[PDB]
Amino acid sequence: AFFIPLYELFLTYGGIFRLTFGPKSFLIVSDPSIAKHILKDNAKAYSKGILAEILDFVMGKGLIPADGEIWRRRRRAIVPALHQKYVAAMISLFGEASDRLCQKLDAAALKGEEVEMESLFSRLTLDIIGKAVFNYDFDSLTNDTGVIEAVYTVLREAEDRSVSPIPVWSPRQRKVATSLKLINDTLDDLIATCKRMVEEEELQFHEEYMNERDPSILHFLLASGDVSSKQLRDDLMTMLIAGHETSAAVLTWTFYLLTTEPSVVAKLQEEVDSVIGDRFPTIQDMKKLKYTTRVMNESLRLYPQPPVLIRRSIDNDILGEYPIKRGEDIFISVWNLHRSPLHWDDAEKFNPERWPLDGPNPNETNQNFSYLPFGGGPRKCIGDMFASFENVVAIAMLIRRFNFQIAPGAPPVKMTTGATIHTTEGLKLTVTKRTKPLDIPSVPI
Ligand code: HEM
Ligand SMILES: CC1=C(/C=C/C(C)=C/C=C/C(C)=C/C=O)C(C)(C)CCC1
């Protein structure tokens, strides 16, 4: 909840102030022009600062905590893997995995059982990202394994390291090392298997390269003639963490928000029934699911993942009107930017159509850095199309099949400090079926 007090301090003291706690301090930036200066116009004057001390233990030299030449080299190598053909193929994976979740919800609906949606969404996004990135099937939606428990142990340690530098106003360290070893060994097995597959395949590599039997990013990188084993594992681990935690929270907060506005749910149900019905969405459906897209856009506005971006000055600069030297630890409050009453009409209202339904999708450019769901400038998210489609698919397929409501007596929904916005106790919902089992599958065109 660290960003919550920063909001009211922003209202009183403005778009840049120094939050001091004893002999240390952070600069808190909530001004879109200043954010644009740091993230895009003058990014060369900034490092990821504290972000690296948080994530280094698991991401190593991966893209998110990296800076300098190793960042530039790996960025140029990895971005080509997320080409249009790859993203189009991942939409099939999104639908298959979302359908496996629907089967779980359908079983609960038939028994009248309530469901805790945050944990289910975490399993869904873990299953998707493991397959998309390095061709592994966690199947966390169905089972628990030592590999799955290792990932969540590592995730929890990353959460602990995120809260550690933040002011408030062994045996675990051995379990972490064991979990890291199991995941690294697991990745090593996949890398070895994939190299064998690359050596035996007959496919000329091109800019749209994709082996249809193994379309993972790991396979693209290996067939491209890419670096060391440590570096490749770090690259994969970074994308695993990034693509799991973010969308798990986006889906959680999207369905929380849906319970707050029945008229939005009605309009969403109308679109999904009309556009996809019971179908697995395709790439063509991504442009037609316009209201679903806006619901996702508005969820990311109200609950950004992460709610803050972290930088450190490595040179002199000017922020707003204020000169700074190198060494300033800076938190850009995406939360404040997204909820600023100066730049948003009825900023606290869940209103998917605050951007025209038939107009351009909102991004950091056309919102002039008052909206930054995927960051901006050279360090902008590389999975932004991937994740946007992933969440549209999950939302649409679930809303097609079920009605969701806050469960009676459910624990309150409150936020926590972390890399992403988790709830305190989950999102406990009742789930009822919208369609009949004996109805013929409906395929609209
Ligand atoms: C809703 C889902 C997601 C959200 C909200 C999100 C958000 C972000 C943000 C805000 C940044 C910029 C961080 C900074 O500037 O310090 C970022 C970077 C990054 N994200 Fe995403 N992300 C999502 C999903 C994904 C996925 C699915 C992948 C990979 C398949 C991914 C991989 C990355 C990588 C590698 C970077 C580092 C880029 C660089 O520094 O060159 N993310 N993400
Ligand atoms: C950059 C990045 C990530 C890490 C964020 C972290 C580590 C945030 C720390 C936030 C703090 C300290 C908030 C305090 O209120 C993710 C979510 C892994 C993936 C998407 C982009």
Identify which ligand lies nearest to the alpha carbon of 337.
Answer: 1
Q: Is 420 in the pocket of ligand 2 (CB under 6 A)?
A: yes
Ligand nearest to the CA of 254: 1
Measured in angstroms, the resolution is: 2.0
Method underlying the structure: X-ray
CA of 419 to the centre of ligand 2 (A): 4
Assigned fold of 2-433: Cytochrome p450 (1.10.630)
For residues 161 and 58, is the Cβ–Cβ distance under 8 A? no
381 annotated as belonging to a binding site for a ligand: yes
Q: Which residues, 6 or more positions from 386, have their beta carbon under 8 angstroms from its beta carbon?
A: 82, 87, 90, 132, 243
- Gap between the Cα atoms of 220 and 198, Å rounded: 9
Please tell me the distance between residue 274's alpha carbon and the centre of ligand 2 in angstroms. 37
b (16+ CB within 10 A) / e for 144-178: eeebbebbebbbebbbebbeeeeeeeeeeeebbee
DSSP string for residues in 236-267: HHHHHHHHHHHHHHHHHHHHHHHHH-HHHHHH
Name, in order, each residue with C-beta under 8 angstroms of 198's C-beta and a sequence gap of 6 or more. Answer: 219, 222, 223
CA 386 – ligand 1 centroid, Å: 10
Tell me, in angstroms, the distance from the centre of ligand 1 to residue 370's CA. 18
Please, are residues 293 and 284 in contact by the beta-carbon 8 Å criterion?
A: no
CA 104 from chain center: how many Å? 23
| Ligand 2 near 86 CB (within 6 A) | no
Atom of ligand 2 nearest to the CA of 162: 12
Cis before residue 306, ω within 30 degrees of 0?
yes
Are 247 and 157 in contact by the 8 Å Cβ rule? The answer is no
Which ligand 1 atom sits nearest the alpha carbon of residue 64?
37
Q: How far apart are CA 140 and CA 432, in angstroms?
A: 23
Please report, to the nearest 10 degrees, the dihedral formed by the alpha carbons of residues 421, 54, 245, 115 taken in order. Answer: -60
Give 3 Cα–ligand 1 centroid separation in angstroms.
20
The protein residue whose alpha carbon is closest to atom 5 in ligand 2 is: 419
- Residue closest by Cα to atom 9 of ligand 1: 374
CB of 255 shorter than 6 A to ligand 2? no
In which region does residue 121 sit, left (phi positive, over 0), alpha (psi from -120 to 50) or beta (all else)? alpha
For 74, the token pair is 């790996």
Ligand 2 proximity of 92 Cβ (cutoff 6 Å):
no
Q: Take atom 43 of ligand 1 and give the residue whose Cα is closest.
A: 381
- Chain-centroid distance of CA 115 in Å reads 22
Strands 16-21 and 317-319: unpaired
**Among 328, 332, 303, which residue's Cα sits nearest to residue 313?**
328
Q: How remote is the CA of residue 306 from the centroid of ligand 1, in Å?
A: 9
Residue 382 and residue 332: Cα distance in Å, rounded?
19
Q: Considering only CA atoms, which residue is closest to atom 6 of ligand 2?
A: 419
d(CA 373, CA 301) in angstroms, rounded, equals 7
**Quick one: which atom of ligand 2 is closest to the CA of 54?**
7
Q: Roughly how many angstroms between the first and final C-alpha of the chain, as a whole number?
A: 45
